[PDB]
Every structure is written in structure tokens, then in C-alpha cells.
From a paper:
Two distinct protein domains are present in [name]: an N-terminal [name] (band 4.1/ezrin/radixin/moesin) and a C-terminal RING domain. In contrast to secreted PCSK9, which interacts with the LDLR extracellularly, [name] is a 45-kDa cytoplasmic protein that interacts with the intracellular tail of the LDLR via its [name] domain.
Moreover, there are clear differences in the F3c′ region, where the FERM344 crystal structure has an α helix (α7), following the [name], which spans residues 279–300 and folds back onto the [name]. Because the expression construct used to crystallize [name] has an incomplete F3c′, helix α7 is unfolded and helix α6 is shorter in all of the three [name] monomer structures. In fact, in two of the three copies in the asymmetric unit, this unraveled region contacts another [name] molecule, where it takes on the role of the interacting peptide. The unraveled peptide binds in the [name] peptide-binding site, making an interaction that closely resembles the β-β association observed in many [name]-substrate peptide complexes. This confirms that the [name] subunit is intrinsically capable of forming the peptide interaction observed in other [name] receptor interactions.
Residue numbers in the entry: 186 to 283
């Protein structure tokens, strides 16, 4: 079901990002879980060439940025689209009586 994307963190550690129904899943290359990020916590998503940045809200109230380095601009666009468009499936909104 979930589409896993190959990324590298700030240090260079190989990770796997899984975009699912509840949110973002961060794992190691052997799929061992590390952390999970729910979509309401995700404030923003940014793409700068091969890189993808995420603005995450903390339970404290403040916002911090997560960096994900990728092999190509098409790989980054694939992860950016996954976070942005599976949000147009998570966060739905329309009129009823038109």
C-alpha cells in the first residue's frame, strides 16, 4: 500500500520515508521504525532541487525544519508530491448545498 522513498538525513544516514493515511513514517533502510509524524503537525513542505524540507509543529508550540537529501530532483518531486497530494486525501474540504 504505502510508497517508500529513499532519503538521506542531515548527517548522511540512509532512511526510508513512508507516506500513508495517518501520516509520515520514518524508518531505517531495513524498515525498522524510528518515528511517525502525523499530518496536522506538518505545517509546510519545501523542495529545493534534490532536497525536501518539512516544517513540523512541536507539542511545545514552536516549529522546526527536517531535512531530507535525495539522489535527484525527480526523486525529490516524487516525495514532495506524495506529502502534498496525499494531504489532498487527508485534509478534504468542500460545499454541500451549492
Amino acid at each position: 500500500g504505502i510508497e517508500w522513498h529513499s532519503v538521506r538525513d542531515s548527517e548522511g544516514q540512509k532512511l526510508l520515508i513512508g507516506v500513508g493515511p495517518e501520516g509520515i513514517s520514518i524508518c531505517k533502510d531495513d524498515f525498522s521504525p524510528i518515528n511517525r509524524i502525523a499530518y496536522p503537525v506538518v505545517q509546510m513542505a519545501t523542495q529545493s532541487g534534490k532536497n525536501v524540507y518539512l516544517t513540523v509543529t512541536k507539542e511545545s508550540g514552536n516549529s522546526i525544519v527536517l531535512l531530507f537529501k535525495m539522489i535527484s530532483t525527480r526523486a525529490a518531486s516524487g516525495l514532495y508530491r506524495a506529502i502534498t497530494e496525499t494531504h489532498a486525501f487527508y485534509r478534504c474540504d468542500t460545499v454541500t448545498s451549492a
